[PDB]
Structure 1
Amino acid sequence: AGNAARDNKKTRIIPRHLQLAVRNDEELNKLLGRVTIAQGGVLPNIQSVLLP
């Protein structure tokens, strides 16, 4: 989360950072696969056929 916070130029850990930290790690994503995180959203990924 601290590494994710440095990515968007933030010095405070916010629930968006925690969701990004959990989902980026494969071990954390599988462990928390059935876990819902409030005010975290999802990963900013777009499928390949959707880009022009």
Structure 2
Amino acid sequence: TRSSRAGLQFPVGRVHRLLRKGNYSERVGAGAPVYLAAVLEYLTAEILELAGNAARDNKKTRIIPRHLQLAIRNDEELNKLLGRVTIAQGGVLPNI
């Protein structure tokens, strides 16, 4: 599989097919889906790292939307990235 060749866990074939069927360009090079999969995997790893930290901070072993909201709004770079999104059941940060 093309994920194994790149040492990845995200799919390369699926992403290539979505880029192909998304009406983005006439043709798609072979180095774009690998790079994009790597970026997405890095970003999800960062998100899940901070959300797991936030869930342990609450002494829970399973991540809920509240911990995702806390991880997002507590990280400056992520909170700047996800500045317009609202998370259902995410709540708000404690701020008086």
Do these two structures clear the TM 0.5 threshold for a shared fold by scoring above it? yes
TM norm structure 2: 0.47
Return the structure number with greater relative CO, CA threshold 8 A, min gap 6.
1
Structure 1 stretches (4+) deviating beyond 6 angstroms? none
Q: Compute the displacement of 1:44 (Å).
A: 1.1
Task: Provide the aligned C-alpha RMSD in A.
Answer: 0.6
Q: Compute the displacement of 1:45 (Å).
A: 1.6
Q: Distance in 1 between matches of 2:77 and 2:91?
A: 19
Q: Distance in 2 between matches of 1:30 and 1:22?
A: 9
Q: Structure 2 unaligned runs (5+)? A: 1-50
Q: Which has the higher helix share?
A: 2
Q: Would you say 1:11 and 2:61 are equivalent positions?
A: yes
Q: Distance in 1 between matches of 2:60 and 2:93?
A: 18
Q: Structure 1 unaligned runs (5+)? A: 47-52
Q: Secondary structure at the match of 2:70?
A: helix
* Identical residues among aligned pairs (%): 98
Q: Distance in 1 between matches of 2:95 and 2:63?
A: 22
Q: Distance in 2 between matches of 1:45 and 1:11?
A: 26
Pair member with larger Rg: 2
Q: Distance in 2 between matches of 1:28 and 1:35?
A: 11
